[PDB]
Design a protein around this ligand. Structure first.
Ligand SMILES: COC(=O)c1cc(OC)c(O)c(OC)c1
Length: 283
């Protein structure tokens, strides 16, 4: 049922989407050991998850002071939105992973290293994504079906994941956070452009759907960065990802709070994973 719009507008999920759905995806608490020691994450599996099918996968990072349990906690309840959207056909079934930048030497800035070496192989060896194997080659070969996003300091994580992991990830959802690399918006945009240049990828092979609230403090630093990125040839600004690859959704009145930011995921996640997808769909 999903069709791309070229300038999608903010729309909260209905209030009923915040209550439990009978078609509930399973959430699995996992523990693994990597370069930052023994750590945990949650894996949301869609209702009807079949390991003999292949699922898109979206990794989603919490904000400062939060943890791997926050996004599926009572303070956010993102799983209820996921369950309802998948059941109603708004969102194709996917795996959603909530890891953490806490623990050991890990930070919001450096998490991408653990993401590459430990998180992707742990999760994607266990669960059925488009990765046929979890060697670097297997991960890279399935990059069009892998996304990363996050809120606030997790938005910063997302930008560092983008710059350092274009080989592994095609879709990016930075929420209420900017990219801290640079002394001007142009430095930030140029770093992203250089990463794209180095990757060799075409403009049809990476996608950025950024979002924040018009009353969210992070807008102050995101907006200049977004404007500098718009000026790059590397980005074609539109939410219609059949035609371009870059959008910035600004929710009127919304403040720096998961209560709003969960709706940005509701609005944006349905836009992901249709370019070079393996099903025959018309969006
Ligand atoms: C609590 O505030 C933040 O996390 C935050 C993060 C940002 O980028 C990662 C911001 O740009 C920001 O602007 C006020 C605030």
């Amino acid at each position: 049922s999903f069709k791309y719009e070229s300038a999608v507008q903010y729309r909260p999920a209905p209030d009923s989407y915040l209550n439990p759905c009978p078609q509930a995806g399973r959430i699995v608490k996992e523990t693994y050991t990597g370069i930052n020691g023994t750590k945990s994450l949650n894996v949301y599996l869609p209702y009807g998850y079949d390991p003999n099918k292949k699922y898109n996968i979206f990794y989603l990072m919490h904000g400062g002071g939060e943890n791997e349990n926050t996004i599926f906690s009572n303070d956010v309840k993102l799983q209820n939105i996921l369950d309802h959207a998948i059941m109603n056909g708004e969102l194709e079934p996917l795996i959603v992973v909530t890891p953490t930048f806490n623990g050991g030497n890990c930070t919001a800035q450096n998490f991408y290293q653990e993401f590459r070496q430990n998180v992707i192989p742990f999760v994607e060896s266990k669960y059925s994504t488009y990765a046929e194997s979890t060697t670097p080659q297997g991960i890279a070969a399935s990059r069009m079906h892998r996304g990363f996003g996050g809120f606030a300091m997790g938005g910063l994580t997302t930008w560092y994941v983008m710059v350092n992991c274009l080989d592994y990830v095609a879709y990016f959802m930075p929420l209420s956070g900017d990219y801290w690399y640079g002394n001007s918006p142009q430095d930030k945009a140029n770093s992203i452009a250089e990463a794209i240049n180095r990757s060799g990828l075409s403009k049809r092979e990476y996608f950025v759907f950024a979002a924040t609230g018009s009353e969210d403090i992070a807008y102050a630093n995101m907006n200049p960065q977004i404007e500098a990125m718009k000026a790059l040839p590397h980005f074609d600004y539109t939410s219609d990802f059949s035609k371009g690859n870059f959008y910035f959704l600004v929710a009127p009145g919304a403040t720096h709070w998961w209560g709003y930011v969960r709706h940005y995921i509701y609005d944006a996640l349905p836009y992901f994973f249709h370019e070079l997808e393996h099903h025959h769909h018309h969006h």
